């Protein structure tokens, strides 16, 4: 059986993935509705990536004889325009990585090194998303909003 606090941490990370799946999927379809197809496609792939993380977390929790929690869905940060949507994704990711670091600390302490390795792989993927997000927000500043949107119309 797994450590009770490891399973709590894994369920907390899973909860964050479930928010991100839905937030990124809606943002993707919003961008597609507006004709910003390059943003819509990239955001769809971000949503798929979170779906795959959730899958791996669910599988680990079950192996450890815990109960995966897919019932509690936290608050989606839905923006009303491109700049707010990107900032909402970044705010979500900054919370996501804080929780990941706390979970890894606990895994190391109780010697659950396989759970730590899984979380470290998720953390790397979220830091890559932060890299993308900070880059997009900087580009809006460097080229202007209307030029940035123009750049993201075509796939």
The residues of the shown chain that bind ligand HEM, judged by CB under 6 A, are 18, 21-22, 25, 48, 51-52, 54-55, 58, 70
> How big is the chain by its Cα radius of gyration, in Å?
17
Rounded to a whole number of angstroms, the minimum distance from the CB of residue 40 to ligand HEM is: 12
Give the contacts of 21 (CB within 8 A, at least 6 positions apart): 47, 50, 51, 54
> Residue 116: which of 103, 127, 125, 130 has the closest Cα?
103
In this structure, the dihedral spanned by the alpha carbons of residues 137, 26, 104 and 113, taken in order and rounded to 10 degrees, is -120
Rounded to a whole number of angstroms, the minimum distance from the CB of residue 78 to a copy of itself is: 8
Cβ atoms within 10 Å, residue 89: 23
Rounded to a whole number of angstroms, the minimum distance from the CB of residue 120 to ligand HEM is: 20
Rounded to a whole number of angstroms, the minimum distance from the CB of residue 136 to ligand HEM is: 22
The residues of the shown chain that bind a copy of itself, judged by CB under 8 A, are 18, 22-23, 25-26, 29-30, 32-36, 55, 58-59, 62-63, 68, 70-71, 73, 75-76, 94, 97, 101, 104-105, 111, 113-114, 117, 120, 123-124, 127, 130-131, 135-136, 138-139, 142-144, 146-151, 153-154
């Amino acid at each position: 059986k797994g450590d009770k606090k490891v399973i709590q941490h894994l369920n907390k990370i899973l909860g964050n993935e479930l928010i991100a799946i839905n937030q990124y999927f809606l943002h993707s379809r919003m961008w597609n509705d507006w004709g910003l197809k390059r943003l819509g496609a990239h955001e769809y792939h971000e949503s798929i990536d979170e779906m795959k993380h959730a899958d791996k977390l669910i599988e680990r929790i079950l192996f450890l004889e815990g109960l995966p929690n897919l019932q509690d869905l936290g608050k989606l940060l839905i923006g009303e325009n491109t700049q707010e949507m990107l900032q909402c994704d970044l705010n979500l990711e900054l919370k996501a990585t804080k929780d990941l670091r706390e979970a890894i600390v606990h895994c190391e302490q109780v010697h659950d090194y396989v759970s730590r390795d899984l979380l470290k792989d998720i953390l790397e993927s979220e830091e890559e998303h932060i890299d993308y997000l900070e880059t997009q927000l900087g580009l809006i500043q460097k080229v202007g909003l209307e030029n940035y949107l123009l750049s993201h119309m075509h796939e």
